[PDB]
Ligand binder design. Structure first.
Ligand code: NA
Length: 208
């Protein structure tokens, strides 16, 4: 409902807030979004972006939709900063709630449309646990391919992922959500038993 010049200004400010957040979260000593005190630069950027989306919602969905595309696109860049990943997942989940369930589902669908290998970052998975955006079939298929390809330390990534989602007393996934990875990993252990991660994993499997 705004003039193309007025709407563009909001888009550029959404991006400047994400540029600012990237900077602020990186520099900041705090490693987690919870341990952030009041006041804090990271929280002040988050505050302004949310207040921008709340004002912009009154005219149209478009701004919240755009902000979510940008945040998602940033997460897919696979940043490793836990403070940044947590801040980004926080802002995303807020804008999904602000924007209603139509837009909130569109975000789930966008995540579930991405090639599994994009999520093959433990720090990214960790950040996204507690959202509906993780697709265990896609993630499973991705690791399965890496293990088949005998990619350096994939058995280690698999063990690590399992301690992260299964071994967690309140689990977010089932051991069966990872059949294909388990098979791929077992096949590699069958071929070359003389591997270090192979011993730890052989035990984890026989344990369950
Ligand atoms: Na930091």
């Amino acid at each position: 409902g705004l003039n193309q010049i007025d709407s563009r200004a909001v888009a550029e400010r959404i991006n400047k807030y994400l540029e600012q957040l990237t900077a602020a979260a990186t520099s900041a000593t705090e490693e987690h979004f919870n341990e952030l005190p009041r006041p804090h630069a990271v929280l002040d950027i988050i505050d302004a972006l949310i207040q921008l989306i709340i004002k912009a919602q009154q005219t149209s969905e478009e701004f919240a939709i755009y902000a979510l595309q940008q945040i998602s696109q940033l997460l897919f860049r696979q940043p490793e900063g836990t403070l940044l990943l947590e801040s980004l997942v926080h802002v995303l989940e807020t804008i999904r709630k602000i924007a209603g369930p139509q837009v909130s589902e569109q975000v789930r669908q966008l995540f579930h449309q991405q090639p599994g290998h994009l999520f093959l970052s433990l720090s990214l998975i960790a950040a996204l646990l507690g959202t509906d955006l993780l697709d265990w079939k896609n993630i499973d298929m991705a690791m399965a391919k890496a293990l088949e390809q005998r990619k350096e330390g994939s058995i280690d990534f698999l063990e690590q992922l399992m301690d992260l989602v299964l071994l967690n007393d309140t689990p977010l996934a089932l051991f069966t959500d990872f059949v294909r990875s388990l098979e791929a990993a077992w096949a590699w252990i069958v071929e070359d038993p003389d591997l270090p991660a192979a011993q730890r994993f052989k035990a984890k499997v026989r344990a369950q």
